Every structure is written in structure tokens, then in C-alpha cells.
Write a protein that binds this ligand. Structure first.
Ligand SMILES: *[C@@H]1O[C@H](CO)[C@@H](O[C@@H]2O[C@H](CO)[C@@H](O)[C@H](O)[C@H]2NC(C)=O)[C@H](O)[C@H]1NC(C)=O
Ligand code: NAG
Ligand code: NAG
Lengths: 227, 165
């Protein structure tokens, strides 16, 4: 009455939860995670050290099978906001990353939970900005008329696809959103590609899923030609 | 008698509080947040990387509906100071920011609470210095006679206007 309904809802849904373990109640199927990326800026291209710096936004969606509630019991509430430290999150990792500290390349604040039923779980959505330090091989044979292609690989560091599965989410113009991209004074983006691959462990008969993102960039040679 | 009145006031107002959730008791209206900025310095303008560095002071004001008390019960006290970790704070975010760590661009120490009544809540004011790394597009066509305009966008990262305005 004199306290927010969110207090009671959080106390109810947070009772038996353990965030340190995967919330897999159904044995048959794994947990599906959908990932989408939007590119905003190309900060730096480093040829001597062979890395690329990008600024992007990432969205991940999955279903938690242990956080369901009945809306009618809680004043017809169908949504709530919780801190990212309270609940379990998949370990989405950039395999070819040159940054070891996640506090300088990511910023997680909150997650949104939408109920699907008392015994059906809730849908979890996580959106956060990030800065990627991607190591890619650069060919400078046709400088300054060269074009480069660097790959981004995403997946689970420790979980096989029988537990966590990954699927890509694409936009209207392509796999990677470019509607809010900031134009660079030295590079131009030509296109993007996405590919989903299942890879076999070389010690076990189990698979894991990897997502490959391709970005094609071309140099602008007017400055060098005129200078 | 031999202990500060602030001890009892904080113990009274901090009893049933949960800082991890928004303190919205009234269903009809959202929580209104007022923001003001003061500019102190322009540290650096970076053209190759297209970002701007500023030093500014930010003030935010809102009403917490769960932290009200009667002044007459506590020796006619109408103000108190509390650490920013104790109470709930809105997530004011600079959308076009190039800095991912908030410990190197912000410094929060304390908040001030002014009571509005036992069942009316308290007014919360938060002032802190900050350093902004703002990415803006620069046009160098008229260099060195050029003028630039960079935009700063502020808002809530996860809450719609039906909750925080
Ligand atoms: C793990 O991934 C491999 C990828 O090669 C899968 O291998 C495929 O197996 C089917 C039969 O089950 C064949 O028809 C395909 O030709 C195989 N792929 C290729 C590229 O040859 C495998 O099925 C996956 N699952 C496991 C091993 O359980
Ligand atoms: C939603 O639940 C509340 C319970 O407080 C009820 O008063 C209201 O009529 C319900 N509305 C609908 C559309 O079910
Ligand atoms: C304020 O409250 C105190 C209670 O300790 C009382 O002694 C004092 O007279 C009050 N003053 C006013 C102006 O109400």
C-alpha cells in the first residue's frame, strides 16, 4: 500500500534465485541468445600494431526460465527493471580481442524482464555500449588505394551449444546497423556480412557456435595524392 | 542524548528502504528530474579522432517518495547528508560518450535530503564535477576560419518517460 509494487515483485522473484549458475530447468533444449550490433564510429586504425578500434552498441535477448510471475497477483504488472549484478548473464566474448579489462570496454547498468507466465519464465533484454579493440591482419600492398577486411568473432568462452546457442539478428540495410554511423575522414564502409558456424572441440564430441561479422573498409587517397 | 540526532534520523529513514528499486509510490505520475550544467573549461579538441573534452559541473534534483520524516520528532531537523551509495539515483547518461568507465569521468560523494513531510517524501539534490568525452562531427572546410557545433544528449538509458521524466 505505502511501498512500491516493485519491492514485492522483486522480493517474490528473487527468493530462490542463484545467479552463479545457469538457469536451465528444461533438460531437452539449450538457451538461445540473439545478438545484434550497431556501428557508430571508427575511432582508430593501427597498422604497426595491427588492431582496429570501434564504438558500437550491443543488444542481447534470451529467456530466463526461473524468473516468471503472474501479472494479476502484482497489480497487473508485466515489466520490471533490475541491476545486471542480480541475475545471470551469458558470457558473450569477442575471441580476437586485444583488451583484457572489461571495465574499460563495456558498461552494463540494468536489464529488463518481461514475464511470460508463472511457470514459463521471463524474457531478458540487455543493451549496453562498448568499445572493441579488434586485431585484424592488414594488407598494405596497394597503399594508399587499399581496402581492408577485419573479422569479429563472437561466442561462448566455456559453454557448448548444448547449453547456450547463439543466433544473429540483422537490420534492414544489413547485418550491422549503419543508420547512425559517424563518417570517418580517412575510411569508408562498403558493406557488412554475417555467418553462423558450428565448430567441433578437438578433445570432445561436442560442438559450439560462433558468429562471424565481416566489415569492409576502403581508404580515401585524396590527401596522399594531393600531398 | 549522548549521540548525534543524525544517527537516529538516518536509522529511522533507512529502515524499510531498498536502494536497488525505483521509489515510486504514487501510480499516477512519474518522477521528474531537473538537470543543469555549468561549463568551466575546454580541455581538448581532437579532429583526427573526432571528440571533444569538457570539464563541467552537473546538478540533479528530484523527489524521493520514501524518505520523509516529521521535523518535530527529531529536534526540529529539516536537513541531512547521506552517501550516494545509500539511496537510489537516476541513471542520467550521455548518449554520445566515448568513455566506458564512470570512475574516470565522474565523482559522487554525498547527497542532500530536505524533508517535505512524513508521507510526502524528501527533496534530493546531487551535485558533482565531471569530465565529458563527447564525439561530434567536425567540418574542416573553412580551416582555420571554421566554427563547430557539437551536441550533448542526455536521458535515461533504460526507463521510459512514464517512470522518469
Ligand atoms: C557439429 O558440427 C559438425 C560440423 O561439421 C556437424 O557435422 C555434420 O554432420 C552431419 C551429420 O550429422 C553431416 O551431414 C554434415 O555433412 C556434417 N558437416 C560437415 C561440414 O560435413 C555435426 O553434425 C555437429 N553436431 C554434432 C557433432 O553433434
Ligand atoms: C489488472 O489487475 C488489477 C489488480 O490490481 C485489476 O484491478 C485490473 O482490473 C486488471 N486489469 C485488467 C485489464 O485485467
Ligand atoms: C523545534 O523542535 C524542538 C524540539 O526539540 C523544540 O524544542 C523547539 O521549540 C521547536 N522550535 C520551533 C520553532 O518549532
Amino acid at each position: 500500500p505505502d511501498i512500491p509494487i516493485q519491492y514485492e515483485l522483486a522480493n517474490n522473484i528473487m527468493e530462490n534465485y542463484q545467479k552463479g549458475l545457469i538457469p536451465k530447468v528444461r533438460k531437452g533444449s539449450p538457451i538461445n541468445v540473439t545478438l545484434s550490433l550497431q556501428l557508430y564510429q571508427i575511432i582508430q586504425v593501427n597498422e604497426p600494431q595491427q588492431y582496429l578500434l570501434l564504438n558500437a552498441w550491443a543488444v542481447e535477448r534470451w529467456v530466463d526460465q526461473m524468473l516468471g510471475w503472474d501479472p494479476s497477483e502484482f497489480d497487473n504488472e508485466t515489466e520490471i527493471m533490475a541491476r545486471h549484478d542480480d541475475i545471470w548473464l551469458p558470457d558473450t566474448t569477442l575471441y580476437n580481442s586485444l583488451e583484457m579489462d572489461d571495465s574499460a570496454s563495456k558498461k552494463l547498468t540494468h536489464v529488463k524482464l518481461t514475464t511470460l507466465g508463472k511457470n514459463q519464465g521471463a524474457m531478458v533484454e540487455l543493451l549496453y555500449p562498448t568499445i572493441y579493440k579488434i586485431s585484424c591482419l592488414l594488407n598494405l600492398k596497394y597503399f594508399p588505394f587499399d581496402t581492408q577486411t577485419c573479422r569479429m568473432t563472437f561466442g561462448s568462452w566455456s559453454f557448448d551449444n548444448s547449453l547456450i546457442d547463439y543466433f544473429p539478428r540483422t537490420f534492414t540495410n544489413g547485418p550491422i546497423g549503419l543508420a547512425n554511423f559517424l563518417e570517418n575522414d580517412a575510411w569508408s564502409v562498403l558493406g557488412t556480412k554475417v555467418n553462423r558456424e558450428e565448430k567441433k572441440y578437438t578433445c570432445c564430441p561436442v560442438n559450439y557456435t560462433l558468429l562471424h561479422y565481416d566489415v569492409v573498409i576502403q581508404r580515401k587517397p585524396l590527401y596522399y595524392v594531393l600531398n
